[PDB]
Write a protein that binds this ligand. Structure first.
Ligand SMILES: CCCCCCCCCCCCCCCC(=O)O
Ligand SMILES: CCCCCCCCCCCCCCCC(=O)O
Lengths: 238, 57, 268, 256, 125, 268, 60, 60, 57, 59, 57
């Protein structure tokens, strides 16, 4: 009998522990593996895939398919704001239910760039130019197009390719920004403006729609995995 | 037959593991398998598309 | 290791990285540098917690049941199902097909139950857990021959030490476990419809081996599941709904998302 | 020279030619292929009807209206009574096959609409009543499209599929259907959508009548809308071709 | 392949993308460049704000009417109160800079109009 | 090893080792030999207990809380803060910036509480401790779904054996922990001011897994902190004041030192 | 099962003890280190720095 | 005394477990083996042998 | 004298075992002995019979 | 490891694998391929739970 | 992969340590790191000053 000492914490149960334990059945012959398509090795790869954004999440719109659609129309004066949403994907209502947001609700810290994709859904004849802008934290949200232009922005033109990508650079003092809203780290403000008035021929509709898609970039990463807020059970299901 | 492997450490250190069972289902999990490939889910389409060319031509 | 951004300088060109087509369905893949001037930054960040194994390698309590040393209900029986706990069910639902070894920890706690009897003396309770494969005879009473377990795996635990632990090899007739089955139990198509059709993992039985004292004692057994050696395919969207039954995916209809005051407003 | 948009697909004795199309999508980057001997559970030789089974089959068209919640088809049921392919499955206990999907919609430049064409493995619809599973007749439509309902099914105590569009019947958000392989048809940019699917299933071969592998779903995120005097009827046509179809378990015809 | 008409210009943190454009014009065939030491009158070192000053700035739009004689802008005055660039000139006695001009108008196929965009050195009204 | 004195002999010289300037702020560095004749002495003394790691590598009790098997207060919640204990706080305050792994030992002791109930029988209590990251749902009642801990680290302890022990990796958004922050939570500067602004380490919850007996039992859980792999920078003077709150450095004003009777006197 | 004996003092808690214990989180990716001025390795170095002396510590 | 930790499930009884335990009698001399016909190594070999089938299993 | 052997694993990984007793009856069971021969019970008859020849001739 | 079936093709022959004599008491040993056309299938199945030791090694 | 290191002993003897975890945060503290440099805190000034020269000249 070799002399042995017992460490503090002997005979304790840790959820996240990795140890060797004896199998219930000795020498079981497992069924042979077969080739299956879409094999998954990382959660991040699922987050890279674009997800439709319910940008118009107000009132009845979430109940209809109108949540995803963003309204646009020909207008008398250029410079009106199409929409505005918070930069963070995890806490904001607009990005909380999307593919990337749902994965983030699972993890405490998030890092890296976000790609936003905008596809015009109007008639071929319809033409227009919009200004999509991201404003860095610690500056009040832009209230006019001139203020928005100071923040980094991409000017988009309808026609030719019908979709545009605004890529938001990561600009954080910290390496990681909390998924839960944090007073210390504010992600930013994202807003859209009319670069020019929408123009249509007679017999073509004045008003069209624009869908938004949100995804993790190559630099994106997560940490400190945690239980998700949305899923709860009053009782075990039957 | 002891196996020596690297530990999980920060950037900018080895742990010995010995199997004491033959069931092979009694082993520890393979936490250190950091391989990813988004090619399946993203860029699914047959004809390859370059980063800066018109998408449809 | 995470990809590291490349420094970029201003240029005027025919090439159009930002412009792309949604219709093709090929997700656009453009770096920050293509959209704006950037600086060379090295990244030491690691995608080492997003791995499927790390995400699903943690114990969760699938279910718990109560049995009594005296009275009519001597022993507790639970059919072995992943679905009855929401957190375990939601993460498993993220992949359509999953293959994985199972780690099982049982925690048993006994509470004295108030009674008219007096001067009770209590010898340490010993608890027996026995797992029966489909078609093994079920025990009908606590004193049955079924409790011998000559052909059945079984564990005996004495109160006051580490909880009993076992490792399970991947058990399926199929090559992989199917989280969702779009099918009927029979060829006719009249009958139960659902994943319950492929549900045959057996049943688990827990009893007091011995009674220490005259007074009534109630024991709760909690079952914990930890996936190991995980392998996944065919990923599925987030469930986005509260569960209703463990035998079907039936759901009360749900709004898409929480609602802000206006499209312009930054407040939820 | 050539055009990325122009395409021509030839399967069996059927050829499909569209002047404008979005790039074809292979859902997991895998072409459909015949089963490997290493992976094959069944000893008996399989029968491969070759070109007979592998040809385009055209289904009944639907009308796109300004307020159509959605249209959805169970693909194995769709081709269950069509040509030799419908006959072979009825004759055989086990069948595994690849599927080619082609969705065609034609509209004037002035028209504006966006349809989402997504094929989803193992979609399980959920009944409106919690205590009852959905009925087979509600679950699968043979020779006819099954339509999503904008409103949730009303309170009931009967079998009935839950058809609300945002849940899509799977009780999951419609927007996250991107993870499943899909192709967007925008009237200004795209005439039609082509998706190629590798055979997907845990088992190498499965009885087709009892189990359905994938479900084609069409939903309009953006409603169809046009100025007055434009064509008010728009037709959507679904054409499906089996790929590398093979059969085993020669049996007397019919299912019970 | 590529299209002569499609273009993308990236300066600082601002990117401009037009599906259709006429070939870009360099007015005298000379790209703007920093001043040579051989040609430099002033002894003191110059300060170059780099990307801050060098970014696209968008001005107030105008309405094209069927009877608009014309619209004209003095460019140095135009950017005199805009961002760091407006601040630097107010702070400094001497400034020399190149200028990028981009004029955007959008109309339906049925519309018909022709605008002349000319930059003139030393115009004296 | 400590530096060893060099032997010296009397000399008359232009050089002036003892003479120096305070104004430069370069601390004078003169050996005893320069001021007086000395003898060659070898020193085996070692500076091996002054190392920062040795000074901060000892367990200290940061905080303790009490929860009851019966009555309204079923479980105890404590926000995880170093500041609430003076000894731990003072030593950490010695460096402005510190980087260090954390070792945690929990000691749980249960005391029977006097009661009117009689002939009580007590099965061994089992205690569950669960740590929640910021934004994890908090338990609202002891029987909540939050207690499943599928996504949350958690430990189960049975009374009568070694206290449960865990190792923590360096957790910070920042490169190093900041003992002092001279800053506001918002850009405006109207709001809470202090280190509390950078305070987001999560919360810890403790509950009785089971109740052994009818009589009331009160359990005290004590939390112990041991720095490991320590790294320090920017050293700060000794605090020199009694603490008042754990959220601010507010202090009652304090005399510089204890006072002697006279400048000449050797008595304190 | 190798035969083993238990030493006196098994299952005891010592404040100043150095042992190996299992991490609460497996494979956490720690934030990268960055250069900081005035790094400290020994307490004695802080004591070498001169400190003002309240020699006249009487009364007021 | 080497430091040791105790795994969860210590002191538990599993029907299907394979471990080393001390013999009741030390150094017993076992009786020598002798050749026996029909030695069995696998259950499947017994199943390969044909068995008569009670196909008419009705009533009497 | 440690012995290294293969573990029980699936198809389409070694465990160390050391004997701490000399009784030899204290060793683990020989689970991995996958040898079979139906020749005794099936095809018992002296004269060998070919798969496809008349059984009696 | 379990024996793996061999692929077979149709033939007309004097040889009679299916025909046999019960009276001899030699159990008939005929593969599925002799009775019908078959396809080459590899088997990874293992007879590792039928061993007498595994069957009788449980308390 | 055992590591052999010296023990803490008096003046005027080796301990074996093996890592059984891969987290790397489960290791023992680095007590034996006896390195010091007062140059930062003491003698901070740019121009070097000799021990016996007038401090200001
Ligand atoms: C001896 C006591 C323990 C008995 C354990 C019996 C084996 C249980 C295996 C359950 C696997 C569940 C897999 C996911 C859900 C499913 O596919 O059914
Ligand atoms: C699983 C139970 C234990 C949970 C431990 C959670 C992590 C606590 C980490 C506290 C670090 C404190 C560092 C010094 C003070 C500060 O910087 O906030």
């Amino acid at each position: 009998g070799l002399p042995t000492m017992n460490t503090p914490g002997s005979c304790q149960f840790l959820t996240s522990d990795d140890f060797q334990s004896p199998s219930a059945m000795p020498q079981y012959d497992v069924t042979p593996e077969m080739r299956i398509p879409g094999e998954v090795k990382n959660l991040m790869e699922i987050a890279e895939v674009d997800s439709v954004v319910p940008v118009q999440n107000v009132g009845e719109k979430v109940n209809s398919m109108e949540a995803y659609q963003i309204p646009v129309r020909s207008n008398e004066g250029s410079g009106t704001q199409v929409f505005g949403f918070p930069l963070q994907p995890g806490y904001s209502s607009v990005f909380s239910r999307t593919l990337l947001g749902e994965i983030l609700n699972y993890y405490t810290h998030w890092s890296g760039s976000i790609k936003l994709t905008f596809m015009f859904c109007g008639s071929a004849m319809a033409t227009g130019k919009f200004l999509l802008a991201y404003s860095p934290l610690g500056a009040g949200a832009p209230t006019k197009r001139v203020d928005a232009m100071l923040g980094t922005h991409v000017v988009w033109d309808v026609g030719l390719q019908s979709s545009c990508v605004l890529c938001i650079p990561w600009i954080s003092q910290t390496h990681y920004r909390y998924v839960a809203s944090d007073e210390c780290t504010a992600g930013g403000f994202i807003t859209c403006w009319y670069q020019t008035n929408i123009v249509v021929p007679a017999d073509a509709q004045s008003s069209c729609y624009i869908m938004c898609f949100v995804s993790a970039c190559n630099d994106f990463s997560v940490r400190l995995l945690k239980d998700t807020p949305f899923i709860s059970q009053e009782n075990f299901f039957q | 037959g002891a196996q020596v492997s690297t530990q999980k450490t920060g950037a900018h250190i080895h742990y010995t593991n010995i199997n004491y069972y033959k069931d092979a289902a009694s082993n520890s999990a393979t936490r250190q398998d950091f391989a990813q490939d988004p090619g399946k889910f993203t860029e699914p389409v047959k004809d390859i598309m370059i980063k800066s060319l018109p998408a449809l031509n | 290791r995470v990809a590291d951004t490349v420094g970029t300088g201003p240029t005027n060109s025919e090439a159009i990285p930002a412009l792309t087509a949604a219709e093709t369905g090929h997700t656009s893949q453009v770096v920050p540098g293509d959209t704006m001037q950037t600086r060379h930054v090295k990244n030491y960040h690691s995608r080492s917690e997003s791995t499927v194994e790390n995400f699903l390698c943690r114990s969760a309590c699938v279910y718990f049941t109560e049995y009594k040393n005296s009275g009519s209900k001597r022993y507790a029986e639970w059919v072995v199902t992943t679905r009855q706990a929401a957190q375990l069910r939601r993460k498993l639902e993220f992949f359509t097909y999953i293959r994985f070894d199972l780690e099982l920890t049982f925690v048993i706690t006994s509470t004295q139950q108030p009674s008219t009897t007096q001067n009770q003396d209590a010898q340490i309770l010993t608890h027996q857990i026995m797992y029966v494969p489909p078609g093994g005879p079920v025990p009908d009473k606590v004193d049955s021959y079924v409790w011998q377990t000559s052909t059945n795996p079984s564990v005996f635990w004495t109160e006051g030490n580490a909880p009993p632990r076992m490792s399970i090899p991947f058990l399926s007739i199929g090559n992989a476990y199917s989280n969702f089955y779009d099918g009927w139990s029979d060829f006719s198509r009249d009958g139960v419809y659902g994943i319950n059709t492929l549900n045959s993992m057996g049943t688990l039985y827990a009893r007091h081996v011995n009674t220490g004292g005259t007074g009534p004692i109630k024991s709760t057994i909690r079952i914990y599941f930890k996936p190991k050696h995980v392998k996944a395919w065919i990923p599925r969207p987030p469930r986005l709904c509260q569960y209703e039954k463990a035998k079907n995916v039936n759901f009360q209809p749900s709004g898409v998302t929480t609602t802000r005051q206006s499209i312009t407003a930054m407040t939820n | 020279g050539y055009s990325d948009r122009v395409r021509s697909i030839t399967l069996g004795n059927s050829t499909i030619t569209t002047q404008e199309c979005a790039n074809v999508v292979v859902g997991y980057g895998v072409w459909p292929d015949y089963l490997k001997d290493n992976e094959a559970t069944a000893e008996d030789q399989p029968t491969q009807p070759d070109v007979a089974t592998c040809r385009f089959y055209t289904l009944d068209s639907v009308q796109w209206q300004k307020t159509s919640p959605g249209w959805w088809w169970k693909l194995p049921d769709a081709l269950s009574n069509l040509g030799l392919f419908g006959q072979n499955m009825q004759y055989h206990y086990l069948g595994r096959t690849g599927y080619t999907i082609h969705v065609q919609c034609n509209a004037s430049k002035f028209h504006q609409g966006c349809l989402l064409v997504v094929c989803v493995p193992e979609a399980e619809m959920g009944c409106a009543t919690l205590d009852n599973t959905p009925s087979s007749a509600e679950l699968l439509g043979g020779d006819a499209a099954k339509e999503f309902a904008g409103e949730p099914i009303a309170s009931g105590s009967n079998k009935l599929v839950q058809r609300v569009v945002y849940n899509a019947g799977m009780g999951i958000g419609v927007g996250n259907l991107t993870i499943f392989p899909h192709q967007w048809i925008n009237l200004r940019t795209n005439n039609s959508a082509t998706i190629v699917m590798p055979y997907t299933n845990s088992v190498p071969m499965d009885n087709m009548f009892r189990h359905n592998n994938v479900t084609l779903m069409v939903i309009p995120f953006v409603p169809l809308d046009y100025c007055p005097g434009s064509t008010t009827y728009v037709p959507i046509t679904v054409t499906i071709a089996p790929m590398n179809a093979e059969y085993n378990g020669l049996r007397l015809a019919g299912h019970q």
